[PDB]
Write a protein that binds this ligand. Structure first.
Ligand SMILES: O=c1cc(O)n([C@@H]2O[C@H](COP(=O)(O)O)[C@@H](O)[C@H]2O)c(=O)[nH]1
Ligand SMILES: O=c1cc(O)n([C@@H]2O[C@H](COP(=O)(O)O)[C@@H](O)[C@H]2O)c(=O)[nH]1
Lengths: 215, 213
């Protein structure tokens, strides 16, 4: 995927009018938008096609798919039919669950991103300990796209080592309570930024500032 | 939670007309319906209030919530605002992620179910090893409702030991797990396709209910 400015917008506003306005304002800097359940459950799956048409952006559906294989397939298919370019899926439910999502993505000409490790404090309890193994499972399954935490660069470096240089890696948890934009981009292909942009008084300026900091 | 006949319908059909037809056909047996992303993503979140209105049933939103705290908070608010009586949340992402859902539920007067172990084969890779710790985490958080797999009776028994007798436990994967034995440990069983794909859902439900007593 070709992510403009290596910066992905996490559009987690839950009001259509506000989500549209903010996303529109930063289209000059960002052409790849991560849409998750807060927006989708508030405004409907139609919002994905609307965003694509209105802003001419790529959409990553951040649905953290985490069910049994048959249910996973149903979610993935519905999500791709709704126009998503890619979908983010959890690895902790096991290889069969992940394989199911890969089935559907292959069948429909779309992409799966595998979430191997998370950025919040609770990730220390069970996810961190499984992270290397989940990433290796991804490699064994032929996964090419990954999501991993910027909150700790040493962990992010280890992930990149597991998945190789050819794999695509995107990373959330950027900022004060997270990692540094520049440092993260030593290992990740793109960073994901949400509230710092969408709650900013001037979202366009917030985005420009982040891109400046990583010139 | 009072589940009629200890039997929860997993309404995973993706067509509103068919979902409504089948649910109507078994309402005389089942008053508690699990609605997941397949139906909600196809037909929209409004389907939850429509089910509760049309059937006078309780709805468990099976969204397997598995994000960071701030995102889980948003998902739970939207879900409860849509009328869900309960939401199912993953424990694997850790305590703060679960706490977020619990706090929202408690603020809104709704319920959280903690999913501790899953029923499918891949569950053995990562989740099974963490399942008892996840249940113990839930217990300390004050979780009172749990989900665990009918396909592994020994695991289900241990989960019941951990959560204690006062906690509420529901269990899918029946087919597969046996209804009667599962109910030695679970308060209710969850059943999907063997009811909703049947020639006669009512009889299918009636049969299951019969095999229990
Ligand atoms: O480990 C992870 C995985 C995520 O998807 N995310 C997601 O990335 C986004 C981050 O947004 P924010 O920059 O406002 O923290 C949110 O949509 C969140 O759900 C995350 O923060 N950490
Ligand atoms: O471990 C689990 C957790 C679940 O929620 N489920 C859910 O329970 C339901 C089971 O449906 P079925 O009886 O047709 O197998 C599905 O909605 C599925 O997503 C499961 O099967 N195993």
């Amino acid at each position: 995927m070709d992510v403009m400015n290596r910066l992905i917008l996490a559009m987690d506003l839950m009001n259509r009018d506000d989500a549209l306005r903010v996303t529109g304002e930063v289209r000059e800097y960002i052409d790849t938008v991560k849409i998750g359940y807060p927006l989708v459950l508030s405004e409907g799956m139609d919002i994905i096609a609307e965003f694509r048409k209105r802003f001419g952006c790529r959409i990553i559906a951040d649905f953290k798919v985490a069910d049994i294989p048959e249910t996973n397939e149903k979610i993935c298919r519905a999500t791709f039919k709704a126009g998503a370019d890619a979908i983010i899926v959890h690895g902790f439910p096991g290889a069969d669950s992940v394989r199911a999502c890969l089935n559907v993505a292959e069948e429909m000409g779309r992409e799966v991103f595998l979430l191997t490790e998370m950025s919040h404090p609770g990730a220390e309890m069970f996810i961190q300990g499984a992270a290397d193994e989940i990433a290796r499972m991804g490699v064994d399954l032929g996964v090419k796209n990954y999501v991993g935490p910027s909150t700790r660069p040493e962990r992010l470096s280890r992930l990149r080592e597991i998945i190789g240089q050819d794999s695509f890696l995107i990373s959330p948890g950027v900022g004060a309570a997270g990692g540094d934009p520049g440092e993260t981009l030593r290992f990740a292909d793109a960073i994901i930024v949400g509230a710092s942009i969408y709650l900013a008084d001037n979202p366009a300026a917030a985005a420009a500032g982040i891109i400046e900091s990583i010139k």
